[PDB]
Structure 1
Amino acid sequence: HGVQVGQVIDRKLTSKGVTFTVAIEPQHRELVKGDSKFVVNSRVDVKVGLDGVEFLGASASEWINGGIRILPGDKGEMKASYPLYANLEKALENSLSDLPTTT
């Protein structure tokens, strides 16, 4: 919510991919609620058209800060591992792959 609540302690590279170990301060630990969606807040998406202008991903301050944005939910069991979504659209759609599922 625009306020720093944690810090990426370390990053590791394995065969599967990239694993980030992060820490959240005890002051804002309850605000996570255990059903959080993590979005890459280090990249910026720009779309321009005749009337539609979208500046998503991160703002200017969010870009100069970098890191991982957190979207809290309501209830969860505090699972060990969480996926890192590319953007808010994929985080909402719960789609890990870039292409959507064929229906």
Structure 2
Amino acid sequence: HGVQVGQVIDRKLTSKGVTFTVAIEPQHRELVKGDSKFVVNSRVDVKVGLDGVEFLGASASEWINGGIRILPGDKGEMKASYPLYANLEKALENSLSDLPTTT
């Protein structure tokens, strides 16, 4: 919600991909609500058009800050691993793959 509640501790590169270990302060520990989402805010996206022009990803303060945005949830059990989504649209669609599934 625009407020810094944590900090990325470390990053490791493996064969499968990249694993980030992050920490959340105890003050906002109760607001995590484990059934939540994490979104990348380190890249800016600009879309232009005749009627729809948008500037997503990160604002100027968000671009100079960077980091990970947290989309909170309602009720969860705080599982260990979490996925990281490339952009907002994929997070909303709950799609963790570039190509959508065939139907």
Shift of 1:93: 1.1
Shift of 1:98: 1.3
Aligned residues: 103
Shift of 1:99: 1.7
- Deviation by residue 1:35-55 (Cα, 9 ceiling, x = unmatched): 110000000110011121110
Distance 2:58 2:10 in 1: 22
Distance 1:21 1:33 in 2: 18
Q: Which runs of 5+ in 2 are unaligned?
A: none
Among the aligned pairs, what percent are the same residue?
100
Shift of 1:96: 0.7
Residue of structure 1 in register with 2:8 after alignment: 8
2:61 is paired with a residue whose SS is: helix
2:31 is paired with a residue whose SS is: helix
Distance 1:59 1:91 in 2: 18
Shift of 1:19: 0.2
1:29 is paired with a residue whose SS is: helix
2:46 is paired with a residue whose SS is: strand
Distance 1:25 1:45 in 2: 30
2:43 is paired with a residue whose SS is: coil
Distance 2:33 2:65 in 1: 24
Distance 2:57 2:98 in 1: 16
Shift of 1:25: 0.5
RMSD between superposed Cα atoms in Å: 0.7
